[PDB]
Enzyme design. Structure first.
Site, PDB file in Angstrom:
ATOM      1  N   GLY A   1     -34.939  -0.896  20.630  1.00  0.00           N
ATOM      2  CA  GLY A   1     -36.227  -1.530  20.801  1.00  0.00           C
ATOM      3  C   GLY A   1     -36.268  -2.329  22.083  1.00  0.00           C
ATOM      4  CD  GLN A   2     -40.890  -2.073  24.106  1.00  0.00           C
ATOM      5  OE1 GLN A   2     -41.589  -2.847  23.451  1.00  0.00           O
ATOM      6  NE2 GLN A   2     -41.373  -0.969  24.663  1.00  0.00           N
TER       7      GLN A   2
ATOM      8  CG  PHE B   1     -35.845 -12.278  28.966  1.00  0.00           C
ATOM      9  CD1 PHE B   1     -36.963 -12.633  29.702  1.00  0.00           C
ATOM     10  CD2 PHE B   1     -35.315 -13.198  28.075  1.00  0.00           C
ATOM     11  CE1 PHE B   1     -37.547 -13.876  29.547  1.00  0.00           C
ATOM     12  CE2 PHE B   1     -35.894 -14.443  27.916  1.00  0.00           C
ATOM     13  CZ  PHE B   1     -37.011 -14.783  28.653  1.00  0.00           C
ATOM     14  N   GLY B   2     -35.840  -7.364  28.242  1.00  0.00           N
ATOM     15  CA  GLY B   2     -35.284  -6.057  28.531  1.00  0.00           C
ATOM     16  C   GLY B   2     -35.279  -5.082  27.372  1.00  0.00           C
ATOM     17  CD  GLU B   3     -36.105   0.911  26.985  1.00  0.00           C
ATOM     18  OE1 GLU B   3     -35.804   1.089  28.184  1.00  0.00           O
ATOM     19  OE2 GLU B   3     -36.804   1.714  26.335  1.00  0.00           O
TER      20      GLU B   3
ATOM     21  CG  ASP C   1     -36.649 -18.613  23.449  1.00  0.00           C
ATOM     22  OD1 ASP C   1     -37.435 -19.006  22.561  1.00  0.00           O
ATOM     23  OD2 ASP C   1     -36.812 -17.546  24.079  1.00  0.00           O
TER      24      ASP C   1
HETATM   25  C1  LIG Z   1     -32.983 -11.611  22.017  1.00  0.00           C
HETATM   26  C2  LIG Z   1     -31.968 -10.763  21.242  1.00  0.00           C
HETATM   27  C3  LIG Z   1     -32.470  -9.319  21.152  1.00  0.00           C
HETATM   28  O1  LIG Z   1     -32.864  -8.721  22.150  1.00  0.00           O
HETATM   29  N1  LIG Z   1     -32.427  -8.776  19.925  1.00  0.00           N
HETATM   30  C4  LIG Z   1     -32.857  -7.521  19.785  1.00  0.00           C
HETATM   31  C5  LIG Z   1     -34.098  -7.233  19.231  1.00  0.00           C
HETATM   32  C6  LIG Z   1     -34.499  -5.907  19.104  1.00  0.00           C
HETATM   33  C7  LIG Z   1     -33.664  -4.878  19.527  1.00  0.00           C
HETATM   34  C8  LIG Z   1     -32.423  -5.168  20.081  1.00  0.00           C
HETATM   35  C9  LIG Z   1     -32.014  -6.493  20.201  1.00  0.00           C
HETATM   36  N2  LIG Z   1     -30.839  -6.847  20.729  1.00  0.00           N
HETATM   37  C10 LIG Z   1     -29.710  -6.396  20.178  1.00  0.00           C
HETATM   38  N3  LIG Z   1     -29.677  -5.701  19.034  1.00  0.00           N
HETATM   39  C11 LIG Z   1     -28.533  -5.248  18.494  1.00  0.00           C
HETATM   40  N4  LIG Z   1     -28.464  -4.539  17.346  1.00  0.00           N
HETATM   41  C12 LIG Z   1     -29.521  -4.047  16.658  1.00  0.00           C
HETATM   42  C13 LIG Z   1     -30.849  -4.081  17.083  1.00  0.00           C
HETATM   43  C14 LIG Z   1     -31.872  -3.553  16.307  1.00  0.00           C
HETATM   44  C15 LIG Z   1     -31.582  -2.966  15.084  1.00  0.00           C
HETATM   45  N5  LIG Z   1     -32.571  -2.464  14.332  1.00  0.00           N
HETATM   46  C16 LIG Z   1     -32.398  -2.282  12.874  1.00  0.00           C
HETATM   47  C17 LIG Z   1     -33.732  -2.576  12.200  1.00  0.00           C
HETATM   48  N6  LIG Z   1     -34.814  -1.683  12.665  1.00  0.00           N
HETATM   49  C18 LIG Z   1     -36.062  -2.460  12.673  1.00  0.00           C
HETATM   50  C19 LIG Z   1     -34.555  -1.114  14.004  1.00  0.00           C
HETATM   51  C20 LIG Z   1     -33.887  -2.127  14.916  1.00  0.00           C
HETATM   52  C21 LIG Z   1     -30.268  -2.919  14.640  1.00  0.00           C
HETATM   53  C22 LIG Z   1     -29.254  -3.450  15.429  1.00  0.00           C
HETATM   54  N7  LIG Z   1     -27.373  -5.522  19.120  1.00  0.00           N
HETATM   55  C23 LIG Z   1     -27.344  -6.255  20.317  1.00  0.00           C
HETATM   56  C24 LIG Z   1     -28.541  -6.704  20.853  1.00  0.00           C
HETATM   57  C25 LIG Z   1     -28.593  -7.421  22.045  1.00  0.00           C
HETATM   58  O2  LIG Z   1     -29.648  -7.924  22.426  1.00  0.00           O
HETATM   59  N8  LIG Z   1     -27.450  -7.466  22.749  1.00  0.00           N
HETATM   60  C26 LIG Z   1     -27.483  -8.087  23.931  1.00  0.00           C
HETATM   61  C27 LIG Z   1     -27.428  -7.297  25.071  1.00  0.00           C
HETATM   62  C28 LIG Z   1     -27.336  -5.913  24.966  1.00  0.00           C
HETATM   63  C29 LIG Z   1     -27.468  -7.910  26.318  1.00  0.00           C
HETATM   64  C30 LIG Z   1     -27.558  -9.296  26.407  1.00  0.00           C
HETATM   65  C31 LIG Z   1     -27.614 -10.077  25.255  1.00  0.00           C
HETATM   66  C32 LIG Z   1     -27.576  -9.474  24.001  1.00  0.00           C
HETATM   67 CL1  LIG Z   1     -27.645 -10.444  22.588  1.00  0.00          CL
END
Ligand SMILES: *CCC(=O)Nc1ccccc1Nc1nc(Nc2ccc(N3CCN(C)CC3)cc2)ncc1C(=O)Nc1c(C)cccc1Cl
Length: 266
Positions: free
Chosen positions: A17-18, A21-23, A129
């Site tokens: 997902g989105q 601050f990013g995808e 935040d």
């Molecule tokens: C602000 C934190 C954020 O961006 N959270 C978020 C929200 C939506 C999608 C992704 C992420 N980040 C994120 N997610 C996950 N794991 C994860 C995401 C989504 C699901 N779903 C299950 C439920 N259904 C609705 C579909 C979506 C399961 C698992 N892991 C890590 C991160 C993340 O943001 N990691 C991260 C990165 C990559 C870079 C910098 C900081 C962080 Cl925290």
């Protein structure tokens, strides 16, 4: 530098997902370790300010903060962290597993969050935040703090989560994070409902300045509502620390509510 990895070592598999601050994607690092990868959409108000979050994540290392794995500093910019298997806490509370979550699980999730913010407190950082949308859930109900783009040493201030002195005058302190934590406690105890129901932004600022506070959520104990009201003191100096909040929430069902009994929702 020290953290950068070749772009070829990553494989963006499933899009999550989105995110903040990013995808965000669910990928694989070196074909062996499952990872999470945030990508910067070019031109969208971020050159290397997108990398400012990974700049903070290099200094802040704690078991209740999302751990930075690697970084790709050539466009498209990739930021690689550990994978939180359950996603956003807000979606988790609204989602399918939220129905069976009772006060013991929700208080423990809060204690994990207070523990992460207690590390931020000791490191003299401010999150700015803190909310259920910026907290990720992993296996075994592990909760970790995320979104460190606005984190600094000592989605811009949503009124309903931000301390009024920070929204009005820019006074962002660790005590303004304790205010946001008190709001997060209402998200936990209401299965992720938006705080201040039926009120717009300017109505929240006027009411909170007049001293209004959210009442005790249904089936929530008064002792936990009192902890929210302490997080919502007008004077930030009189608001509790995260060390106190962590120790309070860990011992909650022994020292505070030893006669707790499960209800319909909490
Ligand atoms: C602000 C934190 C954020 O961006 N959270 C978020 C929200 C939506 C999608 C992704 C992420 N980040 C994120 N997610 C996950 N794991 C994860 C995401 C989504 C699901 N779903 C299950 C439920 N259904 C609705 C579909 C979506 C399961 C698992 N892991 C890590 C991160 C993340 O943001 N990691 C991260 C990165 C990559 C870079 C910098 C900081 C962080 Cl925290």
């Amino acid at each position: 530098d020290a953290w950068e990895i070749p772009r070829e070592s990553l494989r963006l598999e499933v899009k999550l997902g989105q995110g903040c601050f990013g995808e965000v994607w669910m990928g694989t690092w070196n074909g062996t370790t499952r990872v999470a990868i945030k990508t910067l959409k070019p031109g969208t108000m971020s050159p290397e300010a997108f990398l400012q979050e990974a700049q903070v994540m290099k200094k802040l290392r704690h078991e209740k903060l999302v751990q930075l794995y690697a970084v790709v500093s050539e466009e498209p910019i990739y930021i690689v962290t550990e994978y939180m298997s359950k996603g956003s806490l807000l979606d988790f509370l609204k989602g399918e597993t939220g129905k069976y979550l009772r006060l013991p699980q929700l208080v423990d999730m809060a204690a994990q969050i207070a523990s992460g913010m207690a590390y931020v407190e000791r490191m003299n950082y401010v999150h700015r935040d803190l909310r259920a949308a910026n907290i990720l859930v992993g296996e075994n109900l592990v909760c970790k703090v995320a979104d460190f783009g606005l984190a600094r040493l000592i989605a811009k201030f949503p009124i309903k989560w931000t301390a009024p002195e920070a929204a009005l005058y820019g006074r962002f302190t660790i005590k303004s994070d304790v205010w946001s934590f008190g709001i997060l406690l209402t998200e936990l105890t209401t299965k992720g409902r938006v705080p201040y129901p039926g009120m717009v932004n300017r109505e929240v600022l006027d009411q909170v300045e007049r001293g209004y506070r959210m009442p005790c959520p249904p089936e929530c104990p008064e002792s936990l509502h009192d902890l929210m009201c302490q997080c919502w003191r007008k004077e930030p100096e009189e608001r509790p620390t995260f060390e106190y909040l962590q120790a309070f929430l860990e011992d909650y069902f022994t020292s505070t509510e030893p006669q707790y009994q499960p209800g319909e929702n909490l």
